Structures are given as C-alpha cells and as structure tokens.
Nucleic acid binder design. Structure first.
Lengths: 107, 109
DNA sequence: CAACTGAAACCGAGAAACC
DNA sequence: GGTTTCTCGGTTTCAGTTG
C-alpha cells in the first residue's frame, strides 16, 4: 500500500496548487477536482501524472500521454482505499476551483 | 448489469406507449416517437412518458422529491441508446422531419 | 442556454491483476 | 490473504447547433 505515504508526501511538498491541508493536525485535506474540456490542462493533471509516473504505469517516451485514465486511476484508488474517507458534506463540486475533501484515517 | 435492453423490450411489448411499436415479426426492429418539446403537436404526458419511465427505473428521478425535467430524461435515454451495442440506429429510415417524427432502432443479438 | 446533439470525459461496482 | 487496475454499463459535461 504505497498510496498513503505517497499522498501525504505530495501534500506536504506543496508543489500542487489547490492541494492543501485543511487543519494543522494534517488529517483532512482538499484535492482539486475539475472537469476537463478538450484540453486547466496540465497544471491540474500533474498529480494524476505524478501518480502514474510513481507506480510505473506511465514511462516518459514510451507510452502515449493520457490524462483521462490518469485521473480515473487516482479516483478509483482513492475511492477503493481504506486510509482515506471522503467528507462528502465538505466537498465543493459546485464552485469555481472546485475540490473534494478527504480525511486520513489513523493506522 | 445489462438492464437497458430487457427494459426497453418489456416497454415495447407493454403497449403502454403509443407509437412505440415493433416493425417486423421477428421483433428485431422498432420505431420510437421523437417529438420536439418546443412544437405544438407535443403532448407533454404521452411524449415524455417513456423517458420519465427510464429515469424512474434507474432511481435518477423520484416523484414528489426531485423536480421534473423532461429534456434531461430525453438526453439521458438518447445517449444511452447511442452508447450501447445492443441498439443500432438506422438513419436512412428514421424520419425526424414529419409532423410525427420518430427514430428507428435495430436490436443486435 | 430553451431544446437538442455527438463526442468525450466521467463514475461506481464488481472482477481481475498484482503485491 | 491485502491493495491497485481493469471492465462494464450507462450518465453527465462540453462546445456548439436548431439534428
């Protein structure tokens, strides 16, 4: 299970706008969830790229780039994981710069 | 899995929907009315019934709770038919240009 | 942006595929 | 036995058109 530490590292790194902590206990955090158009095209997908690079699912100069399945893989991994739970009453999919709110369960 | 095909077959066989009829004996091709809501020949009840029925069958719409939106129901069903491999539209036989327009669909086995 | 459209992006729920 | 991807069967948004 490499998702937990990986995500925490990426949030602490802060190389991703919109990706912030929600409390000084480092337990709840936002993640930008915007709908792609035909292309907000690369800066947002960086996470979805990073993950695909980390788990070796995308190798630069070997595979064809494909942001939709990167975002989908991360979505399915975050939904099916047990270390993360969506605070649905806190998510905000109905604004400009929308996001989803997640709590990190202790383990 | 696979609810749309059987559901539409039962709807066609139900006779509850005027204009929703088989067009051959083998039950392989069928006609489905396709009236534009903005026109005057449009009966709200009868012409939205099938779309509403699909939006009820899948729990997307709930009576008394949600607010009715016939155009969403229409778009939902149309995109669904387009996506599925069980249904193929026969564009040269659909007549979306008469006073009572309709689409025609063939059921692939 | 009223109703409508095709195409693409999107989604959850199992079922594999990994680990 | 423990996580992450893949598949399937539709659904919803995007960028326009009046189908």
């Amino acid at each position: 299970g490499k998702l937990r530490q990986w995500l925490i590292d990426q949030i602490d790194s802060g190389k991703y706008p919109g990706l912030v902590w929600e409390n000084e206990e480092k337990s709840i955090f936002r993640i930008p969830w915007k709908h792609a158009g035909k292309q907000n095209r690369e800066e947002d997908a960086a996470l979805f790229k990073a993950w695909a690079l980390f788990k070796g699912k995308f190798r630069e100069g070997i595979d064809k780039p494909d942001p939709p399945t990167w975002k989908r893989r991360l979505r399915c991994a975050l939904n099916k994981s047990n270390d993360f739970e969506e605070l649905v009453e806190r998510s905000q999919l109905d604004i400009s710069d929308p996001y989803k709110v997640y709590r990190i369960v202790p383990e």
